[PDB]
């Protein structure tokens, strides 16, 4: 299911850059355990920049 999540992030990564905005990631995380606030907090703990290496985020924060 984190495996699936990574696939979903990849589906919305239109240019296959490995990056998504925090916003994009929150929108997707809503459509799929964490509270809305936990998603915000997790993404902010991971990085202060708006563009997020979603694979690394999943590895560090979710796995």
């Amino acid at each position, epitope marked *: 299911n984190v495996e699936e999540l990574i696939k979903m992030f990849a589906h919305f990564d239109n240019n296959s850059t490995g990056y998504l905005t925090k916003s994009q990631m929150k929108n997707i995380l809503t459509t799929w*355990a964490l*509270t809305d606030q936990e998603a915000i907090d*997790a993404l902010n703990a991971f990085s202060s920049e708006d563009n997020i290496d979603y694979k690394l985020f999943c590895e560090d924060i979710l796995q």
Partner: nanobody
Amino acid sequence: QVQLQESGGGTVQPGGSLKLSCSAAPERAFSNYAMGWFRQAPGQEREFVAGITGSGRSQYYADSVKGRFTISRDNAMNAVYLQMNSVKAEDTAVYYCAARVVPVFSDSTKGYVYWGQGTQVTVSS
């Protein structure tokens, strides 16, 4: 989220025992959140001490504390504990409890989202 507050800090003799508590106020049931203890000695980086899965069923330790420190949690009381036995000089530090947003274990500060306040443990004769 999880609000986290440690207690039980203070002074302990070399070779002695002390137990730290960390109370958690989680938005979801506490068993969803893996917990860890970290410590930061004076002017040093914060380091992993011990971790426990959401359910409490698996516990993990830093090599330097294995066989001396014990981590446990009581999900019915929203608490996590660190029993420190056979304490040594190396153990003097500010101790922090920390929560992940998933129930599986991590040994890295990068795996943790929520942090406590910090409590001083001093090993002194």
